[model samples]
Target: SVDLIGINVAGAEFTGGKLPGKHGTHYFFPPEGYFEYWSEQGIHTVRFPLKWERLQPSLNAELDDVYASLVDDMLDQAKENDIKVILDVHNYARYRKKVIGTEDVPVSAYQDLMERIAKRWQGHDALFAYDIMNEPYGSADKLWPAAAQAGIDGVRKYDKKRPLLIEGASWSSAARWPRYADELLKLKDPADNMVFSAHVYIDEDASGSYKKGPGKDFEPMIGVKRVEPFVNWLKEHGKKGHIGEFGIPNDDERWLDAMDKLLAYLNENCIPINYWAAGPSWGNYKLSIEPKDGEKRPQVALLKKYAAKDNCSDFGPAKAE
Candidate 1:
C-alpha cells in the first residue's frame, strides 16, 4: 500500500499574482473544520498550500508574522488531529514577478524561503515534508533544477529529517517528468531525504482541465502510462516519489474507474499521493473532493479505502550513499 494518502487543502493559495493579498477576500487558510473532518475520515496526511509573497513580502526579509501565525495555527490543528502536513509553497518558483535563479530573484532568495520555513517548523510532529515550490514552469522551465538544489541546501542546514519535495518544471507533469526533469537526479541533499513530486491529469492534453470532455479517447491505462516515466525514474535512482496532485471530474463514472486504477498502481508501488483538492473555498470545483451540502463527494469513498494505517511502512529502502 502507499505510505501516505492525502488531499491538498487549497484556500491560502487562492488568487495568483496578488502580492500580500487580503486574507478573507483574496486568500485564506483552510477553515477550522478541515483537519478534524479529514482526520475523522481516516486521512492522516495533508498538502497545505500557501503563497510565498504573502509569507515574505520582501526578499531575504523575515516572514510576515500574521501569515506565519496562521501557519502555526494550522499546524497546531493538524497536530491535534494527528495529520501530517506538507507545507506547500504554492508559488510557481517566483517571488512577486521575479523567477527564481534570475538576477532579480536569485537562487539564494529561494534558499532563504526554505531556511525560514525549516527554522520555524523543523521538529513539528505534524510537519511531514516541505514542498519547495508548486508547479514551477514558464521561465523557470530550465532553471528549476538549480532552484530546487538551493532549497535542498537551505533546508538541510536546519531540518535534516523530513523529506524535501522537489516539484519538476513544466507544471511538474508526470508524463513529461523524465524528459523535462532528468537533471533533478543530480540534485544533492546532504541527508539524502528527497522526494520527486509530480502531478497527473487524464485529460487529452495532460492539463488538469477536462475541457475536452469525458476521456473517451483515452485508454483506461492512460493514468498508468502517464505516471510510468516518473515512477521509473524513482526506481532507477532509489528516491522517494509523491504524486502531489491528481484528480478527476465527478461527472463521469469512467473517470472514477481511471482514478481507481491509478490509485491501485500507486499503492502497489508504495508511492505517496495527495488528491488535487478539498477546501472551504472549493464550493463547486468538479475535481474538488470536498463534501457538498452534507453529501460526500464521489471520490472520497474511493480515497477512504487507501487511507494511511499503522504498520504501513512500505516506502521501501533508499540506496546507500
Candidate 2:
C-alpha cells in the first residue's frame, strides 16, 4: 500500500444527481477544471467518489457508456498531469441521512457494485486504488469485515494487485479504530493492499465542533489528543493509517490555526492526509478552495503551503514522544 498525501474530489456530485452538461440537474467543477487546479498545486493523489446510482443508472439497465467515457477522460487527465487517483465507491444506508453511515443497500448489491467498479478500472495505472465504501458505521463492525472481505474477493477475481483502501465505521471516526483493528488484522488476502483510514475533526470547543456551525473559537488540540491512541496502535502493527477526511471551519482564525497545528502534528508523524473537499457545497463540511469572493481564504493558503512541501513535511520534526 502506498502512503499518499492528497485531497478528495468528492465523487457523489458527479455520480449522484448533481452534474450537468451531460446528465443530472446540478454541476459544480467541470472535469477539466478539477484536474488543472490540483495539478498546479502539485497534488500527487486524489480520492474521487463514485456513487452506485450514477455508475449503474437504472437498477436493471447496463452501465452508461457516456458515464464510463467521462470517468476515462478524467482518469486520463490525471495521468497526463502525473497524479494518482483513488476511486471511492461512496454510499449511505437508507437509515442514515449522511454519507458516513452504514451500507443502506443490500449486501449482495454492495458486492456487485464493487465487482463492477473493479472490472471497469482494471489495469489502469493512473487509477491508484479503490475505497470500498466511505465512512461506514461503528455499529456495523460485525458486518464490515465480512463486507470488506467480500468486496476484496470480488475485486481480486479480476483486478488482483490494485490497492484496496478501507475505513472504520462511525463516520470514519477515530474512536472506533480499536473496535475493528484486531478483526481487520486477521483478514488474509494475499493480493490485497489494505490500509486503515480515519476522518478526524479534532476541535472539541464550540468553534471547532461540527454541531456548533462555523465560529472563531479554537479548542486546545483536543481532537489530536483523542486520536493519539489509535495512531500509536496503528504504528505498532506496522500498518499504514491516514486521515481520509479532516478540515477546519472556514469562519475562524483559531480553527485555521488549529488546523495548521494539526497538520504539523500529522506531518511529524508521517501520517498521510486528504483534505475533506474541493467543491463549494457538499453538506456541512465544505472545505474547498473555491473562493467565496474574489479573494482566497486562509485555509486555501494553508493547503497550498502544505501541498508545496516535499512529502508534506514543513511542520518542523516529529514531536519527541
TM per candidate: 0.94, 0.79
* Local distance difference test scores for all models: 0.84, 0.63
lDDT of 2 by residue, 1-321 (tens): 343358877644453444323443343333565577667766678887765566666432456677666678778888888778888766642112322124444455556767777787886778987777776664565567667776777677778777677776566676556765777776656763666677777555312256654345546575566567568767667666677777666765666767777677677667777876665235444456544554445776787777665573321123345
lDDT of 1 by residue, 189-228 (tens): 8887777888999888888888876644767888889999
lDDT score at residue 258, model 2, on the 0-100 scale: 71
TM-score of 1: 0.94
Q: C-alpha displacement of 165 in model 2, angstroms?
A: 0.7
Number of the top lDDT candidate:
1
Q: After superposition, how far is residue 11 of candidate 1 from its true place, in Å?
A: 0.9
After the best TM-score superposition of candidate 1, give how far the Cα of residue 22 lies from its true spot, in angstroms.
1.9
